[PDB]
Amino acid sequence: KNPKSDKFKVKRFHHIEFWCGDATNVARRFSWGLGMRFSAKSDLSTGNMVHASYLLTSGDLRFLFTAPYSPSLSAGEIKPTTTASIPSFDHGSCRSFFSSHGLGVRAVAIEVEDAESAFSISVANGAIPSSPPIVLNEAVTIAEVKLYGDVVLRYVSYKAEEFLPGFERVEDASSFPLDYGIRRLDHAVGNVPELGPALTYVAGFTGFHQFAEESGLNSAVLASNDEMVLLPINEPVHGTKRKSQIQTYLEHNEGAGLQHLALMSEDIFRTLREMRKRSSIGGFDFMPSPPPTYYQNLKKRVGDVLSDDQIKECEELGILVDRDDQGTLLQIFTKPLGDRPTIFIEIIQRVGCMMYQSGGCGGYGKGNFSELFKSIEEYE
């Protein structure tokens, strides 16, 4: 059941912004590791004396990396005269965020019809304001409300139907056309100490509905009207055999924040071949693969969806498979993206639910908790 109760018109995920100590090194590492092209910049070379921001793209996926310059460079500016291209940016906020949490996601940005209306309606319905609507070059409006922890939900609306005003398209020489098949953000997942209050807050100001659904967590998924914006949230379950990875997250992150980004691939086998080639030469590492029994047991579970060759290729790449009543999910998880055992990435591809493909087809892999534990003891 989908009551379609969005309190304002939401379109799709627009971008994810990481707050960094050095945006250049994180952006270059991510570009190589994920196969994303350098698409736009806002920095000293574009007149921005406040922050360095670099945009990577792969298909419709947009990753922004931002770091502060010395405040001395902009000490004469005031907000009316700022050279920042993202007017919500604040040196103190960014340094405090990075000191507290390490490298991680500051903003989950969604495109809406009217960011000023979305902001007003959100705050009227309980959202804690973070940055009020600001119109950039009479062309784009951006506004921010608190989502959880120090993560904001950023509203972006466009008059037209680039990236942001003040960003420039990087030079072709500096823009190598990397592409490992990643195409869009499927979902963005938060970790909180208490699920109930978090859900009530976010669903309260968005009108997002709950998407139709002992391993250390309880979870729920909030979804927009067409279920294309998907925001799962996890809480820990205490007193378990193995320590909850949600609680480890909260400890090392200094509280709530974004846990993982799930990136849809048009060909998860190519994406994983390309990412695994680069794991030890600057890219990303993946979690340890499941035992071979897990892949033996895939025949009974998804033998009607994947061939034996396609199953065998899942086995060499360490890909996980889950299935609901509507579709099938291929997924795999990276090791944490930086120093702390906090944020990681999920690569996914969904099969089924053809109408375009409806959102969340195949679920989120919750069935892989039981299948992994089963396969663990089976191969033992």
Ligand X SMILES: Cc1cccc(C)c1-n1c(=O)c2cc(C(=O)C3=C(O)CCCC3=O)ccc2n(C)c1=O
Q: How far is the CB of 178 from a copy of itself (least distance, A)?
A: 6
**Paired tokens of 372:** 């992994």
Out of 155, 167, 284, 364, the residue judged to bind ligand X by CB under 6 A: 364
- Which residues in the chain are followed by a discontinuity, with C-to-N distance exceeding 2.5 angstroms? 161, 213, 355
The site map against Co ion for 252-281 (x = CB under 5 A) is ----------x-------------------
Count residues near Co ion (CB under 5 A).
Answer: 3
Q: Is 346 annotated as a binding residue?
A: yes
Task: Name the DSSP letter for residue 207.
Answer: -
Under rule CB under 5 A, residue 186 binds Co ion = no
Under rule CB under 6 A, residue 340 binds ligand X = no
Under rule CB under 8 A, residue 178 binds a copy of itself = yes
Contact 30, 56 (CB under 8 A): yes
Out of 33, 68, 149, 232, the residue judged to bind ligand X by CB under 6 A: 232
Out of 43, 144, 150, 346, the residue judged to bind Co ion by CB under 5 A: 346
Where do the H-state alpha helices sit in 75-130?
Answer: 91-101, 115-124
175 interacts with, out of ligand X, Co ion, a copy of itself, none, CB within 5 to 8 A per kind: a copy of itself
Under rule CB under 6 A, residue 237 binds ligand X = no
| Window of 35-43, 153-161, 198-206, 363-371 that interacts with Co ion by CB under 5 A | 363-371
Cα 336 to Cα 86, 195, 249, 260, distances in angstroms:
27, 23, 10, 9
333 interacts with, out of ligand X, Co ion, a copy of itself, none, CB within 5 to 8 A per kind: ligand X
Q: How far is the CB of 213 from Co ion (least distance, A)?
A: 13
Q: What is the per-residue burial (b if ≥16 Cβ within 10 Å, else e) of 125-163?
A: eebeebbebbeeeeebbbbbbbbbbbbbbbbbbbeeeeb
Out of 31, 85, 130, 191, the residue judged to bind a copy of itself by CB under 8 A: 31
Q: Is 252 annotated as a binding residue?
A: no
Decide the pairing of beta strands 209-210 and 257-265.
unpaired
Q: Which of 378, 219, 366, 204 is nearest to 290 (CA)?
A: 378
**Paired tokens of 211:** 């998407």
Q: Is 113 annotated as a binding residue?
A: no
Q: How far is the CB of 368 from ligand X (least distance, A)?
A: 4
Contact 64, 57 (CB under 8 A): no
Out of 24, 137, 200, 370, the residue judged to bind a copy of itself by CB under 8 A: 24
User: 3-state SS of the chain: helix, strand, coil percent to 5?
Assistant: 30, 35, 40
Contact 331, 254 (CB under 8 A): no
Under rule CB under 8 A, residue 59 binds a copy of itself = no
Under rule CB under 6 A, residue 44 binds ligand X = no
Contact 360, 211 (CB under 8 A): yes
Count residues near a copy of itself (CB under 8 A).
Answer: 47
Q: Which is nearer to a copy of itself, 282 or 292 (CB)?
A: 282
372 interacts with, out of ligand X, a copy of itself, Co ion, none, CB within 5 to 8 A per kind: ligand X
Terminal Cα distance for the chain, rounded: 41
Q: Beta-carbon neighbour count of residue 307 at 10 Å? A: 9
Binding residues for Fe cation: 187, 260, 346
- Positions touching ligand X (CB under 6 A) are 187, 189, 219, 232, 234, 245, 262, 287, 333, 346, 364-366, 368-369, 372
Residues near a copy of itself, by CB under 8 A: 20-26, 28-33, 38, 43-44, 52, 67, 69-70, 72-73, 95, 98-100, 102-103, 173-176, 178, 251-254, 280-283, 285, 337-341
